[PDB]
Amino acid sequence: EMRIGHGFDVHAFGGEGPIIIGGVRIPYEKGLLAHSDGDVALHALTDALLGAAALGDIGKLFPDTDPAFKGADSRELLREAWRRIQAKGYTLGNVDVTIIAQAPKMLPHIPQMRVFIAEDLGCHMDDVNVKATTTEKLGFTGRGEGIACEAVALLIK
Amino acid sequence: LEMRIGHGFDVHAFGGEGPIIIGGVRIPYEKGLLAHSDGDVALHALTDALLGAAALGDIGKLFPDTDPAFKGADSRELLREAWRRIQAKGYTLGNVDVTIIAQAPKMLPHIPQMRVFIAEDLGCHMDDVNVKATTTEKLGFTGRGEGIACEAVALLIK
Amino acid sequence: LEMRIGHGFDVHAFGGEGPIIIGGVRIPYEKGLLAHSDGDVALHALTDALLGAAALGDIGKLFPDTDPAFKGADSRELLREAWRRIQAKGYTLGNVDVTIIAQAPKMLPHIPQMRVFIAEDLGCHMDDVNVKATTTEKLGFTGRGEGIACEAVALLIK
Numbered sequence: 153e154m155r156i157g158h159g160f161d162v163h164a165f166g167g168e169g170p171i172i173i174g175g176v177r178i179p180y181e182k183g184l185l186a187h188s189d190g191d192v193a194l195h196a197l198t199d200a201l202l203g204a205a206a207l208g209d210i211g212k213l214f215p216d217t218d219p220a221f222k223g224a225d226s227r228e229l230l231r232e233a234w235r236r237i238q239a240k241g242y243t244l245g246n247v248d249v250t251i252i253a254q255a256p257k258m259l260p261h262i263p264q265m266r267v268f269i270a271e272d273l274g275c276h277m278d279d280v281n282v283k284a285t286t287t288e289k290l291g292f293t294g295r296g297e298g299i300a301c302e303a304v305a306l307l308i309k
Numbered sequence: 310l311e312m313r314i315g316h317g318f319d320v321h322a323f324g325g326e327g328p329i330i331i332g333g334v335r336i337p338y339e340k341g342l343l344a345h346s347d348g349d350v351a352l353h354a355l356t357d358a359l360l361g362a363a364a365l366g367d368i369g370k371l372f373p374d375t376d377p378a379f380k381g382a383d384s385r386e387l388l389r390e391a392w393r394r395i396q397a398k399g400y401t402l403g404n405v406d407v408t409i410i411a412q413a414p415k416m417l418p419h420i421p422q423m424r425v426f427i428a429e430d431l432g433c434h435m436d437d438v439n440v441k442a443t444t445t446e447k448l449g450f451t452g453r454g455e456g457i458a459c460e461a462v463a464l465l466i467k
Numbered sequence: 468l469e470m471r472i473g474h475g476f477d478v479h480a481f482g483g484e485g486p487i488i489i490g491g492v493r494i495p496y497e498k499g500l501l502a503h504s505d506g507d508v509a510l511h512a513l514t515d516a517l518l519g520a521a522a523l524g525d526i527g528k529l530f531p532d533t534d535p536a537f538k539g540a541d542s543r544e545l546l547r548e549a550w551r552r553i554q555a556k557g558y559t560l561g562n563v564d565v566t567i568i569a570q571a572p573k574m575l576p577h578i579p580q581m582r583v584f585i586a587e588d589l590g591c592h593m594d595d596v597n598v599k600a601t602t603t604e605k606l607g608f609t610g611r612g613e614g615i616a617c618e619a620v621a622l623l624i625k
């Protein structure tokens with residue numbers, strides 16, 4: 153059996169940098185407003201993984217209303233989601249993540265992001281892709297109001 | 310033997326009175342959605358993903374804005390009919406995953422019923438259907454309460 | 468038997484004179500698309516989907532906006548070079564599905580020609596390439612006619 157999933161997330165800028173994306177602290181004039189650590193990339197990825205396993209989404213598994221997850225390490229959440237996916241008999245095919253942001257520059261950090269995500273999913277780095285694109289000053293990402301991220305995931309068996 | 314991927318995306322603007330129909334579910338809201346059909350963004354994006362996997366183009370290439378026969382149409386009927394044409398070509402369902410993007414109303418209490426509706430229209434197990442929701446934290450047209458967007462991916466098997 | 472999924476997304480802003488180039492096709496329009504290369508949002512998003520599935524990064528990494536060698540670049544050359552690298556890694560094409568998000572110009576008449584170009588660029592049959600277009604009902608930056616967005620998913624086989 154092969155199964156696909158798709159995730160999508162958005163956080164607004166606010167407060168002071170740095171931002172955490174893909175598990176990586178990236179310097180920036182602004183921070184990301186969030187109940188958790190604000191990791192848009194890892195939230196979208198988790199949604200894509202949960203989606204492929206028909207387990208719902210981060211909001212189902214870890215509510216924005218529970219004080220246990222305030223300030224939470226989004227990597228913990230990723231690892232918890234992954235344990236529950238594996239408990240259902242799933243194994244990783246591949247993941248592909250798309251960070252949508254006018255700034256900061258993401259490319260320097262992508263290698264460490266992939267290190268983190270490969271480790272969290274107990275897979276090879278070769279099964280994890282991350283990329284970035286701007287929207288050329290258009291939309292809320294273009295105007296510097298926030299960052300969006302998508303992910304797809306392919307699961308096996 | 311063969312596996313195929315599809316992607317769909319759809320947007321409707323709010324307008325007039327509630328309720329809204331999303332994933333076939335009547336959801337109470339102070340506003341409705343503007344559409345030629347019933348406005349089911351979630352089912353429109355799903356349909357587009359299924360047709361795209363089967364390389365049959367899209368929902369426009371089957372049910373045009375022009376035709377007055379599709380006015381107020383049950384998007385489930387469109388879904389079932391696109392599904393018939395996809396099956397006519399040899400494909401069976403792998404799985405589908407749908408992402409509703411909206412600031413409001415809350416979608417989560419309605420997701421189980423949406424999945425029941427979609428699993429039936431596609432003749433599959435409910436375990437092959439996933440629906441989720443996310444806000445854009447007040448950002449963009451969805452964040453400002455102007456509309457709702459939905460995305461879907463589908464895997465088909467031949 | 469190994470299959471891999473990829474996703475790409477891109478946006479370009481309108482500006483300067485038409486025509487625009489989308490999916491390889493010169494499309495008459497009142498404004499152009501501002502880019503470093505020729506501005507083909509569709510092929511960029513598609514290239515990213517393919518590169519993503521192969522875990523080769525993205526177009527910005529492969530073809531930096533800083534390098535003058537890519538000024539005015541034919542996006543189809545970028546697509547074919549990315550594809551060559553993916554194939555060197557042992558991948559063959561499952562299928563692709565592309566969604567153009569634009570208020571105008573009208574994409575439908577041009578889609579057959581886009582599919583021919585993409586099919587040629589990937590050494591595949593047209594059956595394995597789906598392209599569709601949709602609007603966001605006058606919402607957001609595409610709805611206001613500010614630019615054009617494109618998403619793509621891809622399935623690769625090793």
Ligand SMILES: Nc1ccn([C@@H]2O[C@H](COP(=O)(O)O)[C@@H](O)[C@H]2O)c(=O)n1
Nearest residue numbers: 211411412413414415416417442443444
């Ligand atoms: N319109 C919406 C948007 C999100 N939700 C749910 O609430 C949770 C929190 O929303 P966000 O992920 O957008 O911060 C989501 O995970 C989703 O399950 C909802 O029920 N209705």
Ligand SMILES: Nc1ccn([C@@H]2O[C@H](COP(=O)(O)O)[C@@H](O)[C@H]2O)c(=O)n1
Nearest residue numbers: 369370569570572573574575600601602
């Ligand atoms: N830029 C666009 C947008 C939509 N369209 C067509 O309009 C149909 C319906 O899309 P919308 O009603 O969301 O605009 C699609 O099937 C597509 O063929 C187009 O040809 N060019």
Ligand SMILES: Nc1ccn([C@@H]2O[C@H](COP(=O)(O)O)[C@@H](O)[C@H]2O)c(=O)n1
Nearest residue numbers: 253255256257258259284285286527528
């Ligand atoms: N926030 C961003 C946006 C884009 N990028 C990178 O810059 C390059 C070009 O981005 P654009 O597609 O928006 O022109 C890509 O390589 C992308 O990986 C980045 O490193 N950080």
Ligand SMILES: CC(C)=CCC/C(C)=C/COP(=O)(O)OP(=O)(O)O
Nearest residue numbers: 291292293449450603606607608609
């Ligand atoms: C998920 C996808 C494919 C989104 C692109 C669709 C779109 C037109 C967004 C508008 O930008 P916006 O949300 O920033 O609206 P605005 O520019 O009016 O703030």
Ligand SMILES: C[C@@]1(CO)OP(=O)(O)OP(=O)(O)OC[C@H]1O
Nearest residue numbers: 186187188195210211214216221
């Ligand atoms: C991830 C969760 C978990 O507290 O927190 P946020 O940081 O608000 O992130 P988002 O994906 O916007 O909402 C889902 C929440 O469940």
Ligand SMILES: C[C@@]1(CO)OP(=O)(O)OP(=O)(O)OC[C@H]1O
Nearest residue numbers: 344345346368369372373374379
């Ligand atoms: C469902 C159809 C047909 O009435 O129209 P709407 O419901 O308005 O949705 P839209 O995204 O404008 O186009 C898709 C059409 O197939």
Ligand SMILES: C[C@@]1(CO)OP(=O)(O)OP(=O)(O)OC[C@H]1O
Nearest residue numbers: 502503504526527530531532537
């Ligand atoms: C395609 C490249 C080539 O210089 O430039 P642009 O044509 O500006 O397109 P975009 O996707 O915005 O940037 C990525 C670059 O690789």
Ligand SMILES: [Mn+2]
Nearest residue numbers: 302460476618
């Ligand atoms: Mn998407």
Ligand SMILES: [Zn+2]
Nearest residue numbers: 161162192195
């Ligand atoms: Zn989040």
Ligand SMILES: [Zn+2]
Nearest residue numbers: 319320350353
């Ligand atoms: Zn629609």
Ligand SMILES: [Zn+2]
Nearest residue numbers: 477478508511
């Ligand atoms: Zn581009």
